[PDB]
Amino acid sequence: KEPYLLVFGASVVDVFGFSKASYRPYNSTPGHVKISFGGVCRNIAENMARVGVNTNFMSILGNDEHGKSIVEHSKKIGYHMDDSMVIEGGSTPTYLAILDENGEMVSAIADMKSIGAMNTDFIDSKREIFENAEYTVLDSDNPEIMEYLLKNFKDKTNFILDPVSAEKASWVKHLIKDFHTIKPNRHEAEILAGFPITDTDDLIKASNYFLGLGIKKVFISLDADGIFYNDGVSCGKIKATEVDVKNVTGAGDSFVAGLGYGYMNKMPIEDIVKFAMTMSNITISHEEIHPDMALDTVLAKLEKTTWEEEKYDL
Amino acid sequence: RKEPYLLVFGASVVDVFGFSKASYRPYNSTPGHVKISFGGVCRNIAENMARVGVNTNFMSILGNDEHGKSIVEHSKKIGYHMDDSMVIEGGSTPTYLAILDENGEMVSAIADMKSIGAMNTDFIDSKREIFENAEYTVLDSDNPEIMEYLLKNFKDKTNFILDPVSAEKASWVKHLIKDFHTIKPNRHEAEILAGFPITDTDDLIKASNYFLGLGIKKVFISLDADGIFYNDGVSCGKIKATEVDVKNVTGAGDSFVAGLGYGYMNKMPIEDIVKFAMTMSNITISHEETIHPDMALDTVLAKLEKTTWEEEKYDL
């Protein structure tokens, strides 16, 4: 009914066993067991739901306990997983890891069997959800599924890319042309462009190459040095100057989420970049990966930030 | 509803098992299959009870975390009421995380069994009315100190039922058994509790007669393949079922305790309680899992009708 943003992707349940004693294999070691909900696309969907975006999250789950826990956390926060694939008798993708006294792993099980169950037939049965979406977030996990989604719904919905890694970005450098928005870091952009990006002049040449292919919006993460943008009309670099604490991971997930908010509320380019970066500046500091994220908490920190803005022209 | 209930008091454990689907190597991410299951003797008893229609009150120790919500949701689905349980803020619900190799052997594990020992007298006192108005109260042999507190404070207010768990755990509660209305040991656990070997029928009659002398009202001794030996002071006998093929024994005695619970609540004669509870034990024994997914009152009654029994009755 109301305009929504669709996030398609995997959900991985993380189960960590931290040793609170000396580690010994083959024998039961006492410790704390922590359960956290991960997976790039699930992190993005949660962050969006937390700031008020009408989020639909299409995933792959099993009918086990971990799958039920994901669906319950989904209703609490706000991300609707109502159209997800459910595998009867199958497990929800999980990573089990038994860490020692220092925090380094000694044993691990990756259960990713259910991620391979995604096919073109299930995509077709959920066509209305893909078409009625304003924007659709995808990662670079499966190039074959991406290629299918692009040539079937590129004109119906506006696709947003999160490259994940430099390696995963390389197996998808030929498909980036059909995306409305791409969000790589400095290194993932070097891979997608085909040339080394060392300074501002190379970032302008990179983004213009991406825009030339048919991409409308380009956002390049500069890791601490801010974010670079390119509307095709407006170009710049907006940098923050303050927070940098425990685990700078999960920030890119929060940035994609703020791109989604800024788009749904039709905010000006310079302000979308600022809002999205505030969500990253939060996530970096507080460990917990997401701690707390509310519409007002992001709007509260936003004002008390040193914005080092630089504007460019072509 | 203000209808009579049975109280089960004990631990709830969430088991998380990772089975390797490739050759295991330490410090390395091995591809595998994750299995999540609910355990704890007392939690299994309460589930089996609610499954057959007993109005069950399950008082446990949870942890406010994600595994705590998992147990609670399963309890609302099946019907074992956990409303009066202990919830620890910031604490952890008892969890056992284990990684198995390609052969099935444990090569790594984390035991978060901390919360089981966090039960205190102040909490028992706050919920004293749940114990006092309970028709029967099931306990296992996990915490001897708390058992003594429960027995001393509630033995004349509620009827206690013991599931000894193991022979080792049984020696620690041997001085406390006299206050129980019902004990349910196996051959070896009964030897530990009695203080002499049980090799035949005469020793079974002697062991059970001794337990009745201590003040115990009803005795049930599991004899594995030979069935169940019973004694209530009036009726004594041994009943066995023919055609029972076992796959997995874990959780069978749990289902038997649950069946005693059903029998007591429905005021059934001892021979029928033994048969009903044994049918429940037989169903659980024929499945690989600790609890049969399809078990309900109808399946227990359907299998009870279809069973051929070997019955023996002794006098005196």
Automatic annotation (TrEMBL), chain A:
Offer an example of a GO molecular function term for this protein.
kinase activity
Q: Per the database record, which ranges form the Carbohydrate kinase PfkB domain?
A: 4-291
Signal peptide start and end residues: none
InterPro entries on file: PfkB_dom, Ribokinase-like
Alphabetized, the UniProt keywords read:
Kinase, Transferase
Q: Which PANTHER family match?
A: RIBOKINASE, SUGAR KINASE
Q: What is the protein's given name?
A: Probable sugar kinase
